[PDB]
Amino acid sequence: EWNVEKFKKDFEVNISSLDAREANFDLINIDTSIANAFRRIMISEVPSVAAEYVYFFNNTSVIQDEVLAHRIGLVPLKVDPDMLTWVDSNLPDDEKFTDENTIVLSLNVKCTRNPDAPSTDPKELYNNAHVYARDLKFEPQGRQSTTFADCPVVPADPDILLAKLRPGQEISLKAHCILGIGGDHAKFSPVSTASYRLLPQINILQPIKGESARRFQKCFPPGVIGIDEGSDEAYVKDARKDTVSREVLRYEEFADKVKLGRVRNHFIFNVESAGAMTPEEIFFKSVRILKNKAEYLKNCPITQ
Amino acid sequence: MIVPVRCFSCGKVVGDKWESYLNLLQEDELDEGTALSRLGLKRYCCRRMILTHVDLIEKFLRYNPLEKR
Amino acid sequence: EEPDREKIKLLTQATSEDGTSASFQIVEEDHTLGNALRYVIMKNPDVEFCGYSIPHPSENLLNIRIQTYGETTAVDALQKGLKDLMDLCDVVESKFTEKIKSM
Amino acid sequence: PQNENARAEALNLANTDSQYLTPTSGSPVRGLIQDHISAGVWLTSKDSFFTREQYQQYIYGCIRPEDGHTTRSKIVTLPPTIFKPYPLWTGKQIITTVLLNVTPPDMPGINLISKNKIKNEYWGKGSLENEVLFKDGALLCGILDKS
Amino acid sequence: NTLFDDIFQVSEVDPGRYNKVCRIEAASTTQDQCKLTLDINVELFPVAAQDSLTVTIASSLNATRSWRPPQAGDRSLADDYDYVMYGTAYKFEEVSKDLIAVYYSFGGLLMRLEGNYRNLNNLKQENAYLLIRR
Numbered sequence: 001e002w003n004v005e006k007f008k009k010d011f012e013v014n015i016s017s018l019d020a021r022e023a024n025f026d027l028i029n030i031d032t033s034i035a036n037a038f039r040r041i042m043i044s045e046v047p048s049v050a051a052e053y054v055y056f057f058n059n060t061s062v063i064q065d066e067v068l069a070h071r072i073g074l075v076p077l078k079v080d081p082d083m084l085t086w087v088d089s090n091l092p093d094d095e096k097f098t099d100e101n102t103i104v105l106s107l108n109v110k111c112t113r114n115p116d117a118p119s120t121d122p123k124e125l126y127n128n129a130h131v132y133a134r135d136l137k138f139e140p141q142g143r144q145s146t147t148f149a150d151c152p153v154v155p156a157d158p159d160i161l162l163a164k165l166r167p168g169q170e171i172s173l174k175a176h177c178i179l180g181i182g183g184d185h186a187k188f189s190p191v192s193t194a195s196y197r198l199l200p201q202i203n204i205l206q207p208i209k210g211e212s213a214r215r216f217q218k219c220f221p222p223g224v225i226g227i228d229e230g231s232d233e234a235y236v237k238d239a240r241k242d243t244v245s246r247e248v249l250r251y252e253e254f255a256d257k258v259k260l261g262r263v264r265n266h267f268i269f270n271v272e273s274a275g276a277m278t279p280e281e282i283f284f285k286s287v288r289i290l291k292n293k294a295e296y297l298k299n300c301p302i303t304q
Numbered sequence: 305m306i307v308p309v310r311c312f313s314c315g316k317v318v319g320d321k322w323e324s325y326l327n328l329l330q331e332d333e334l335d336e337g338t339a340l341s342r343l344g345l346k347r348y349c350c351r352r353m354i355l356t357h358v359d360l361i362e363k364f365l366r367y368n369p370l371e372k373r
Numbered sequence: 374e375e376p377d378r379e380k381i382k383l384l385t386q387a388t389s390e391d392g393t394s395a396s397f398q399i400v401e402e403d404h405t406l407g408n409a410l411r412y413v414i415m416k417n418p419d420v421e422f423c424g425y426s427i428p429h430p431s432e433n434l435l436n437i438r439i440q441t442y443g444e445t446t447a448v449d450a451l452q453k454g455l456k457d458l459m460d461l462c463d464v465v466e467s468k469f470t471e472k473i474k475s476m
Numbered sequence: 477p478q479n480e481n482a483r484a485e486a487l488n489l490a491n492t493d494s495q496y497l498t499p500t501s502g503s504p505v506r507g508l509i510q511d512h513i514s515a516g517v518w519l520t521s522k523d524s525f526f527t528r529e530q531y532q533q534y535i536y537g538c539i540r541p542e543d544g545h546t547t548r549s550k551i552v553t554l555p556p557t558i559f560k561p562y563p564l565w566t567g568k569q570i571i572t573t574v575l576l577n578v579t580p581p582d583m584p585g586i587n588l589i590s591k592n593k594i595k596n597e598y599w600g601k602g603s604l605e606n607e608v609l610f611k612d613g614a615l616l617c618g619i620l621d622k623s
Numbered sequence: 624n625t626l627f628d629d630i631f632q633v634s635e636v637d638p639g640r641y642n643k644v645c646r647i648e649a650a651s652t653t654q655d656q657c658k659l660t661l662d663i664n665v666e667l668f669p670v671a672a673q674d675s676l677t678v679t680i681a682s683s684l685n686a687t688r689s690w691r692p693p694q695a696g697d698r699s700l701a702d703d704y705d706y707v708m709y710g711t712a713y714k715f716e717e718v719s720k721d722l723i724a725v726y727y728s729f730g731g732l733l734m735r736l737e738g739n740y741r742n743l744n745n746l747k748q749e750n751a752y753l754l755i756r757r
Contacts, residue, residue: 002416004460013468015476027465033408034461040405062364063306074309076317113371133320159320160309164361168370192316193347274317280473284466291462293406296380297399298455302448303382387541387549394550396542415529418694422551424536428543438536440550442691522731523643525664528692555690557730559707559752561667563692566730600639602646602660604733611713612749616728 022272023279026199028265035196035267041286042194044183048276049079051105051175051187058172063163071163072105072175073187075133076156076274079103083147084179099142103153103177106137111165129165134158136175153177156275190282192272199263200242206257209233216258219248240268305361313349321345325354383448387438392446394422395439402435403427411437413461414454419445507622516620517594522605524567528556531565539577546577568615575613585613593621626744626751627680627736631659636672638665644732649676656722657738662729668706668755677756679704680745684752704754708732711749727751 012028027035054069061068087101112127122129138153163171182189202224208216213234217225226237248254271279307322321343328339336355345351380400387396399406407425414423414437422440439447477483488494498505518524526534535553539545554573558564575586588610596606608618631649638645643666649659652675659678663670670676684700693699701707710729718724718737725745727734734753736745745751 001418004457004464007461008464011464011468013465013472015472018473018476025469030465031412033412034465037405037409038465045405060370062361067305071306071309071319074319157317157320159323160317161307161319161322162309164306164365166365166368166371168368186310186315189315193314272316274315280469283469287462287465287469290406290409291459291466294410294455294458294462297406298452298459299376300380301376301378302397303378304385384542389550396540398542411533412529415532418692421691422532422536422553424533426536426540428540436540436542438541438551520731522662523641525643555709557708557710557732558664558667559709560701560704560754561706564664564667566732568731598640600641600646601637603639609713609728611711614711615731616711616713617731617733 016268018280020273020278021275022270023283024268024270025283027196027267027269030265030267032264032267035269037290038283038286039194039196039269041289042191042271042282043189045181045289046190046282046285047081047179047181048188048190048274049077049081049084049103049177049179050185051075051077052178052180053176055174055176056172057174058170060169061163061165061171062169068163068171068173069175072107072136072173073185075136075160075162076276077103077177078151078154078156078276079177080276081179087178097176097178099144101178102141103148104139104141105153105175105177106139107131107135107162107171107173107175108137109135109163109165109172110170111167113167126165126167130161131163131165131171132158133160133162135162190274190277191279192274194269194271194282196267196269199266199268200239200244201259201261201263202236202239202242203259203261204234204236204257205259207233208254208257212253215251216248216254219251219254305359305364307357307359308353311350311353314347316345316347316350318345318350318353321354322357322359384436388447391443392448393441393443395447397435397437397439397451399435399437401433403433407435407437410454410458413458414439414450416457417445417450417453419443420450513622519567520571520615520619521567522599525558526565526567526570528563528565531556531570534570535573535577539574547580548577551577571620572614575615579613586610587612590618591623592618593623594619624682625679626682626746627678627741629653629657629678631676631678633670633672633674633676636665636670642666645670649678654738657736659737660733660735662732662734663706663755664732675757677704679754679756681752681754682748682750700752701754704756706755708753710734710751710753712745712747712751715747727753729753 010029012026014026014028016024016026051072054072056065059065059068084103085100087096089096109128109131111129114125114127116124133155136155138148140148140152165171180188209230213227216234217227221241221243223238223241224236226235227233244260246260248258249260271283273279273282277285307319309317309319311318324343325339328334328342329336340351340355343354345354382398384396384398388394404427411423411425414420419441420439421442422438425435425437428434428436439450441447441450477486496504496506532553535551539551541549541551554565554569556563557566557569588608590608592606592608594606596603599605605618608620609616630652632652633647633649635648636645643664644662645665647659647661647663647670649661651657651659681700708729710727712725713728714726716724716726721739722737723739723741725736725741
């Protein structure tokens with residue numbers, strides 16, 4: 001029998017490591033359908049900010065215009081979502097981009113030749129030969145010159161090489177950055193990989209002590225199997241460290257004396273980040289999207 | 305051409321790691337396997353994006369119609 | 374005000390006279406909620422049949438079908454399921470809040 | 477086509493349902509092809525066991541009453557073949573259920589003794605998984621193939 | 624009502640290219656004519672060789688309609704055994720004079736009995752519960 005109090009008693013969270021970019025943690029005693037939904041929303045439904053429309057005024061570089069617009073869209077901006085609202089893609093362009101929807105970035109690079117003494121490196125040989133993502137300038141349009149003055153818009157990875165130039169060439173563009181979800185386009189996906197794996201279970205059946213444990217050590221990652229004696233002979237130290245390579249199954253000494261299963265309700269989530277949000281915060285933002293995804297159906301009239 | 309901004313499979317930003325990679329090979333004289341692991345690429349999908357890039361933009365830039373010679 | 378009557382739609386061709394067996398169709402959904410909602414409805418001791426289904430991948434439509442044993446219609450069992458999935462995400466949010474503050 | 481005389485011919489004379497057998501030698505020309513052949517050897521196998529949430533999801537994944545697949549307006553199911561230790565259905569018992577829901581209710585089931593392409597030696601000692609047996613619309617024996 | 628009851632002695636347990644199902648050869652301990660061939664889900668009910676199983680074939684379990692998962696307060700004939708199946712009889716065969724084989728199919732898991740007197744109670748029914756203890 002199942003309940004919500006019966007789920008609250010058994011559910012556990014064990015947080016392995018937490019960082020500004022990645023976060024490993026466990027979800028114990030939850031179903032695969034729920035944990036796949038958390039993995040799903042983090043890739044596909046948590047919104048983020050990325051450049052959507054690019055307005056080239058001049059581009060005399062080698063890179064095509066539509067190629068260079070594509071590269072700007074893939075640059076992860078460190079804008080916090082919930083500072084922006086959502087655009088409305090039906091009412092036309094004279095009314096659509098407000099200062100509360102949109103963040104304007106600009107790029108204005110010219111390449112000139114550097115007079116140098118010496119087959120030489122082009123940082124010492126041209127001026128502004130490489131264009132990086134840190135050359136994107138935040139232009140605080142409208143009344144949000146004061147709410148983005150606390151922390152302005154910057155790319156989360158400022159050394160992304162966008163274009164390369166030679167003297168005479170220039171790029172002058174202006175990109176509007178809008179809010180969107182990763183199901184629409186992968187540039188809005190706030191996670192570098194939201195994924196899980198299921199906890200490996202290594203069931204030893206017969207005692208395989210002795211030198212038949214020294215070679216049972218080596219069929220697993222190093223921290224996985226331990227040895228003491230014929231007593232506490234060969235046991236699982238950490239069944240979380242194991243990559244399921246099944247290397248012990250191709251030796252005939254152990255094809256009867258071990259199994260490889262999974263612990264089916266114990267998930268090991270590894271959430272990374274593209275940069276805009278910390279990975280513990282887009283797990284909260286995912287578990288609340290699924291909750292509101294059900295409220296909006298509960299609070300909705302059943303039609304016809 | 306230029307280094308892909310993101311990786312195709314994982315989605316890690318990879319475009320900031322091409323000049324770092326060529327200095328780990330040149331200056332530090334690392335092999336390609338150690339150089340990719342110090343850059344923090346460890347999924348083999350994200351490894352092959354820096355490992356296997358050709359960088360033809362350096363060969364296109366020699367044909368400049370806006371400067372003499 | 375005026376609500377959104379285009380989201381959830383009872384397909385009346387597959388809905389019984391009693392209301393104990395029905396079909397639904399949700400726009401802009403996929404396996405994400407339909408598999409999580411089918412799990413929670415199937416923990417009702419009154420649901421006899423439940424399953425979601427996506428007719429074609431190229432349109433974003435989600436059919437879920439509930440058949441009860443009686444004594445509760447399939448609309449009553451859909452909204453017990455949405456309520457118990459709202460409650461299930463409050464438990465996960467609370468355990469994950471408490472355990473970040475526990476580091 | 478552009479009138480009701482030509483709609484009636486393309487729905488009753490030239491439709492794909494009346495072209496099941498070819499006129500060359502009376503052989504069937506329509507059937508499933510690559511992954512569906514290699515899934516019936518897995519689904520109708522003897523290791524295939526399904527629990528109630530799995531069983532009911534596979535029946536509604538293929539049969540929608542809203543699209544008019546059922547002949548009953550309510551999806552009927554079967555008792556499991558394992559009651560006590562855990563209630564489980566069998567993969568042959570899913571083929572039985574989908575024939576129960578799409579064939580008309582006021583006829584008896586199908587009765588058929590056929591063969592597979594897969595020899596009994598491939599399944600181990602004493603298996604009879606080469607004989608295909610339908611008895612009153614219930615697949616009781618044998619896996620399902622291209623045959 | 625109970626249609627058959629005997630204590631069988633397992634002689635051979637054969638996996639045979641399966642991961643969850645074994646084929647069980649069992650001769651009886653009361654008579655000398657009835658053998659048992661049976662497929663069981665050995666992940667749910669593990670059987671070794673030289674085991675003694677109590678095989679019962681019942682007609683129903685002790686006015687219901689259809690299968691419905693149990694609750695608190697149920698009372699059934701399955702409450703005695705460890706492994707209950709439900710299948711159909713599809714074939715009768717007289718092996719010789721004074722021997723009768725009945726064949727059962729439990730969703731594809733087959734069973735073949737043997738022996739002589741069971742014209743009394745085994746029939747060609749679409750329904751026979753089958754119950755193995757210990």
